[PDB]
Amino acid sequence: AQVINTNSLSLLTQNNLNKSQSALGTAIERLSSGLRINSAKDDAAGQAI
Amino acid sequence: LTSARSRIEDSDYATEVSNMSRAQILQQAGTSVLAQANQVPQNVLSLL
Amino acid sequence: MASISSLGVGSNLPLDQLLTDLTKNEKGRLTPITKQQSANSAKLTAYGTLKS
Amino acid sequence: SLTKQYLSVSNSIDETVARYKAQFTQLDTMMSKLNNTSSYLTQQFTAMNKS
């Protein structure tokens, strides 16, 4: 009693995958640069200060 | 002023290391589970 | 900041270090400059000696 | 005048060396990001093909 027309379960896994990957990307960027304020996207007030 | 600028801009090594380490585990899991979850409903259902 | 490069497996850190060696090859660029400096310094020293 | 010109040229050269090295550093950080992404993509392909 299931559906071949769609693997909703895999769809569910995928979004979690991308979210984790984005978190990892930001973390590695910060850890490599050595600066956390790498772009205004990070902290508007911080960058201007 | 240099000290203040450093304190604002610089990242915290321990915190960022922790975050990266924790996230990599999520990556490994998610990849494995995605593979397995893709595979199994497929073959069982096809069998029926 | 502490930098901390790599984290992508590749040995980027030492590559950057040896670019700093080629940055020390631009310290080389200075090396012409430093040889010229030493020549001038010796020249001035000789002038002082002759003054004495 | 001459050792002075040396002072000036040394200074300018040093500025340039810092510039080149900095460009290289930022480029390598971009490398780090892309390498990590592609690496996990690769493992995912290998596993899902092993399927």
Secondary structure elements and pairings:
This is part of a larger assembly, with two copies of chain A and two copies of chain C.
Chain A: H1 8-33, H2 44-48
Chain C: H1 12-51
Strand content of chain C: under 5%
**Helical coverage of chain C, percent range:** over 70%
Helix percentage range of chain A:
55-70%
Helix and strand run of chain C: H
Rg calc of chain A:
18 Å
Quaternary structure of the protein: part of a larger assembly
How does the overall form of chain C come out from the CA principal axes?
A: rod-shaped
Structural class by sheet pairing and helices of chain A: mainly alpha
PDB class: transport protein
Keywords: FliC, FliD, cap, filament, flagella, flagellin, transport protein
Entry title: Salmonella cap-filament complex
Chains A, B: Flagellin
What does this structure look like?
The structure is cut from a larger assembly and holds two copies of chain A and two copies of chain C. Chain A is mainly alpha-helical and 49 residues long. Chain A has two helices and no strands. The radius of gyration of chain A is 18 Å and the shape is elongated. The termini of chain A are far apart. Chain C has 52 residues and is mostly helical. Chain C is built from one helix and no strands. Chain C starts with 11 loop residues before the first helix and ends with a helix. Chains in contact: A-B, A-C, A-D, B-C, B-D, C-D. At the A-B interface, helix 1 of A face helix 2 of B. Chain C: Homopentamer.
Give a concise summary.
Chain A is mainly α and 49 residues long. Chain A contains 2 helices and no strands.
Key attributes of the depicted protein:
part of a larger assembly, 4 chains, A: 49 residues, mainly alpha, 2 helices, C: 52 residues, 1 helix
